[PDB]
Structure formats: structure tokens, C-alpha cells
Design a protein around this nucleic acid. Structure first.
Lengths: 61, 82, 208, 226
RNA sequence: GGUCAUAACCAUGUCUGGACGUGGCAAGGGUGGUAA
């Protein structure tokens, strides 16, 4: 019971922010995560990516 | 070696010597394959298909090989009774 | 063996072995050289069996045949008796002789104008030609030789027991070796007697 | 143009089959555990992925009645990230020559490494086959398998070698002196070598055996060829 | 199966001395002139 309930709710949260696919969703793919995917989900990155800026330096301001 | 993907990984499968059932390196320079030529055994003349063996350098350098080559060949030809 | 009588002992050759004193063997044993001896004499001599000689002659010879190009089965001897013998050997069957002092580093070097690179070796007497044997295990050569009854076995894949303290025992054994390889590879086989004499495979010896 | 090239003429048997092109991988050479003697053979199959990483350039010197006499001894690593690495040391009276002497010697001693998985397969190995060791004069390393994404956790010196090997994740433990790095690096190199010599239940299936490249291609090695 | 001898004494040291650091291979050019 510990492995099921924990893993399910862990992976749910990784999917909810979208640093992980649901075409993955196994505990092994947690380990395939890396630094850059987190940093992509940051607000200033998403401002730049999907809204008006001229550089990343603009977007933070 | 086979993964769950069915990918047949590892650069090469190394040969396993018949001397003592263990595996040689890739820089062991005392490990020798020795090809014996078969004959028809009706007239005594060369006939095609060789019997090939392989022996590891470890048993060779201590000097066990003379018995090993004999024992391998004794269960076949051209020694069947010694 | 298993061939009818054409790869089995002949009545003729028994006489030749015994006249050349090959059956007699030195006064010492090893822990590897006691599987070819039968027993000891009244005297300190230890009597090699000739049945045991005959089988070992054959599969030894069959390996010498198995190379496609015979021009690189390099024979070696440095003791005086096995000099005249090897020269006729390597004339009869395609081989490369190395008579006298070996000059070490022959196969180890890259730069040397006497560089060789054979596949097999056939050596007389391990404890006189120890230099090429040691060097064999740096270039992955199989090895064959003629052991007495006390020669050290180490880097010897197959042995062919013999008396080999000189006399006719040396030259006779190299002659028999050359007889077999031609029956198997060539078309000299007829199972009726070979023309060539074991006489001119013997030692030169100080002449009249 | 006005300038040709001519590079490499083999005087070695193994060199001749490669130059005439009948051997087409290193894996053929290694399976018969043949000597290599010419450093162009290795650099023909590879040499399109080999880097060098000069570890140390260390002085040594002997004594004579006229004073000091100094020789420079340098260690140089070599390896592609596909699993072939090697190592060499060499000394000479001058510096640059010693380095270039070491890059040759290092090419000669290249060996393969065998990689495996932590415990569950998902394709593309990432770690060491099993927990192995290797000692050189009271320095040793104990390469211990590791799960994905932990990187190579080692001192700076073995972190070079293991990275060049393409081994992604590893844990190590050392014992004894490691400030005499000539031992330390050779001991790492020793450990990675043993991977193919370690018997595993995988390898218990029987190997077919096949005739030597020397044997099969002997008709091309005799015409005028060495 | 091979033949040969006698050792005294003998301590100490003013002294602020040694050039070593990274694999470049690598000029690349011709107006005058017999003829013209």
C-alpha cells in the first residue's frame, strides 16, 4: 500500500505542472527529470515564451 | 545481453574457453585457438570441416594445457583410446 | 583413432622405434609426465610406451596439416642433433626452419630484419629452446614439442614423447612426423612404403 | 594541388588485413585477443571520436656527478564516449615530445568497457556491469553501480577516466594514498578493464567459435602481402 | 693432491649556489631577357 498510494500522488503532481508526460508516468521516468524542465515552468520564462517581451531580461521587470 | 526493449546490447560477446569454462580478456596474449583438421578415417586424407578449440592463457601458463587438449580430443577423434 | 588400420599402428614402424631406442627414457619424471610412462625398469630407465607415442603423433600432425598455407609453421632447434633433422623436415613439407641460436625478440619486435610471424611452432626439447617458448605467449602461437620424460611442460599444448638425448631417436621422430603430414594432406599416401630414408634425417656426426 | 599523401604502410600482418579492408571493426580483433602493434589501426576504425586529456606533466630526475639531470614524464588519457578508452605514460628529455609520445602509447592500449543497468532495463546502458575493483600498488578503486541521474561521484582524477568511458553514473570508494596519481589512474583503468572478464549468468550460454580472420583471409595475405 | 703472510699515530672545519609549463604543421614568389 505504501508504494501504490505514494507513487500515484507523486506522479500526479509532476504531471499537474507538466514537467512529465502521462505517456511516461512510471517511477523510473522520475529519474529522467533534470534541471532545465523545472526552470521552463517559471513565470518569467513563460511571460517571455507566450507574451510580449524583447528579451528574458525584459520579462522579469 | 537483452533488455526489455529487445535491444541486444553489449559491444561483443566474448568467447569462453573449453579448458576450464571461463572467459578470456581482450589483451590476454597467451589464449590460443588451435584448429585440428579432421580426416575421413577410411584412408587418412583431409576432409573439410575442422574441429576448433580454445584454451585460456591462465591454465596454459601454469602448464595444464597438455592434459586439457588430450581430454577434449579423447571424446572425439583421432584419439579414442590412449 | 577409428580408421581401419590406416591411422593405427603398423608392424614395421615398431621395429624402427626400438632400433633407434626411442622407447627408453630418462631417469626422472614430472607430475605431468607420468601419463605416458608405464613403469620403470630394473635399471633407472623409465619405459615410455609406444602405443601412447603413436596416438599423440597423429593429432599433433593433423594440426600441422590444418593451416591452409604451409609456409609459416616455423620449426626451431638449437641442439646439434636436431639441426640436420629440421632442415630436411622444412624441405619436405613447406615450413620455415630456424637452426642454431634463436636471437630473441624475433616475433616481439616490429623493427628487425629477421622478423617473423608464424602461426604454429614445433620445437625440439623445451629446456634448450626456452627463449622462443616464452615469446610464444606474446603473440598467441599454439605450440608443439618433443618432451623427454622430465622436460617442463608449460606453454606446450600437445606433447609427442621421445627419448631425445641424441642418437637416432631425434632424427627418426622428425622423419615419422614428415611421413604422416604427407599421407594426410598430399597424395603420397599409398600405405606402402615411402621412398625417403630416415637415414638422412639423422645427425651429421663427426665423419670418417 | 601539388602535394600527395602516402600515410601508413603496414609491416604487420594485422595491419595488412585492415589496410586492404577485410576487417571492418575492432570487435573482430578483440574477439581473438590479437596483439596490436601499429597505432594507425585503432585510429582508422576510430580517430573520428578520440580526444586526449593530458592529466599531469610530472618531473623526475636522477643524480650524476655533474649535478641534476631532468626528464619530463607525462600521462595522457584517450577515449571516445562510445566505450573505448585507453591510457599511456611516457617520458623524454623535453616536454612536447613526451606528450606526443604518450598520445601514441595510449592509442595502443585502448580496451572496451561493458556497461549494464541498475536493475531494470529501459534501453541504453548507463552504469557498470557489476561491483568490481582494481588495485595498483595499494591504491584501489571500487566502482559500485548507481541508479540514473546521480552522476559520477569521484575525485577529479578518476572522474576524467569514467567520463571518457561514457559511464554515466557511478559511486566509488578509495583506499590508501591517492596523491601519487600515476598509481591512482592506472588503478581506475585496471577496474574498468575487468568488466568483460567478469562472468555473469547472462554469459552462461555457449559461444559458437569461428575461424580466425588470419585463417579465412589467408589467400589475400599471400600474393605479395605481409 | 695443494700452500703464502704480518695491522703504531691519523682530531677538526669560516659557507646565507643551481636556469623546468603546455602538441601551430605553416615564405609561397618571378616587370628584366637571345627570341620578343
Amino acid at each position: 500500500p505504501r508504494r501504490l498510494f505514494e507513487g500515484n500522488a507523486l506522479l500526479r503532481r509532476l504531471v499537474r505542472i507538466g514537467v512529465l508526460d502521462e505517456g511516461k508516468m512510471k517511477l523510473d521516468y522520475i529519474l529522467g527529470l533534470k534541471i532545465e524542465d523545472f526552470l521552463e515552468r517559471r513565470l518569467q520564462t513563460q511571460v517571455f515564451k507566450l507574451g510580449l517581451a524583447k528579451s528574458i531580461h525584459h520579462a522579469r521587470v | 545481453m537483452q533488455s526489455n526493449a529487445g535491444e541486444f546490447v553489449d559491444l561483443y560477446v566474448p568467447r569462453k574457453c573449453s579448458a576450464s569454462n571461463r572467459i578470456i580478456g581482450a589483451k590476454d596474449h597467451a589464449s590460443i585457438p588451435m584448429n585440428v583438421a579432421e580426416v575421413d578415417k577410411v584412408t587418412g586424407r583431409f576432409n573439410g570441416q575442422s574441429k576448433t578449440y580454445a584454451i585460456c592463457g591462465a591454465i596454459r601458463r601454469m602448464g595444464e594445457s597438455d592434459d586439457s587438449i588430450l581430454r577434449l580430443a579423447k571424446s572425439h577423434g583421432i584419439v579414442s583410446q590412449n | 583413432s577409428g580408421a581401419l588400420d590406416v591411422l593405427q599402428m603398423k608392424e614395421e614402424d615398431v621395429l624402427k622405434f626400438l632400433a633407434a631406442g626411442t622407447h627408453l627414457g630418462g631417469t626422472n619424471l614430472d607430475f605431468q609426465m607420468e601419463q605416458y610412462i608405464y613403469k620403470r625398469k630394473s635399471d633407472g630407465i623409465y619405459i615410455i610406451n609406444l602405443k601412447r607415442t603413436w596416438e599423440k603423433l597423429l593429432l599433433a600432425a593433423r594440426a600441422i596439416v590444418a593451416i591452409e598455407n604451409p609456409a609459416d609453421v616455423s620449426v626451431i632447434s638449437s641442439r646439434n642433433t636436431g639441426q640436420r633433422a629440421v632442415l630436411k623436415f622444412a624441405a619436405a613439407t613447406g615450413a620455415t626452419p630456424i637452426a642454431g641460436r634463436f636471437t630473441p625478440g624475433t616475433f616481439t619486435n616490429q623493427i628487425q630484419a629477421a622478423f617473423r610471424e608464424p602461426r604454429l611452432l614445433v620445437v625440439t626439447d623445451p629446456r634448450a629452446d626456452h627463449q622462443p617458448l616464452t615469446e610464444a605467449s606474446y603473440v598467441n602461437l599454439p605450440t608443439i614439442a618433443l618432451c623427454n620424460t622430465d622436460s617442463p611442460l608449460r606453454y606446450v599444448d600437445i606433447a609427442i614423447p621421445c627419448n631425445n638425448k641424441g642418437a637416432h631417436s631425434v632424427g627418426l621422430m622428425w622423419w615419422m612426423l614428415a611421413r604422416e603430414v604427407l599421407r594426410m594432406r598430399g597424395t603420397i599416401s599409398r600405405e606402402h612404403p615411402w621412398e625417403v630414408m630416415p637415414d638422412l634425417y639423422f645427425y651429421r656426426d663427426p665423419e670418417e | 594541388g601539388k602535394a600527395g599523401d602516402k600515410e601508413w604502410l603496414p609491416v604487420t600482418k594485422l595491419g595488412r588485413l585492415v589496410k586492404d579492408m577485410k576487417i571492418k571493426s575492432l570487435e573482430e580483433i578483440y574477439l581473438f585477443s590479437l596483439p596490436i602493434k601499429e597505432s594507425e589501426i585503432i585510429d582508422f576504425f576510430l580517430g573520428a571520436a578520440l580526444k586526449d586529456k593530458v592529466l599531469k606533466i610530472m618531473p623526475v630526475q636522477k643524480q650524476t656527478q655533474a649535478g641534476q639531470r631532468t626528464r619530463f614524464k607525462a600521462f595522457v588519457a584517450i577515449g571516445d564516449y562510445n566505450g573505448h578508452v585507453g591510457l599511456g605514460m611516457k617520458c623524454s628529455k623535453e616536454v612536447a615530445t613526451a606528450i606526443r609520445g604518450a598520445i601514441i602509447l595510449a592509442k595502443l592500449s585502448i580496451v572496451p568497457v561493458r556497461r549494464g543497468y541498475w536493475g531494470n532495463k529501459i534501453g541504453k546502458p548507463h552504469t557498470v556491469r557489476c561491483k568490481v575493483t582494481g588495485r595498483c600498488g595499494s591504491v584501489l578503486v571500487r566502482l559500485i553501480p548507481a541508479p540514473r541521474g546521480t552522476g559520477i561521484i569521484s575525485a577529479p582524477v578518476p572522474k576524467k577516466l569514467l567520463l571518457m568511458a561514457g559511464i554515466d553514473d557511478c559511486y566509488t570508494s578509495a583506499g590508501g594514498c591517492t596523491a601519487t596519481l600515476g598509481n591512482f589512474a592506472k588503478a581506475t583503468f585496471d577496474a574498468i578493464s575487468k568488466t568483460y572478464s567478469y562472468l555473469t549468468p547472462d554469459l552462461w550460454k555457449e559461444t559458437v567459435f569461428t575461424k580466425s580472420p588470419y585463417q579465412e583471409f589467408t589467400d589475400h595475405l599471400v600474393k605479395t602481402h605481409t
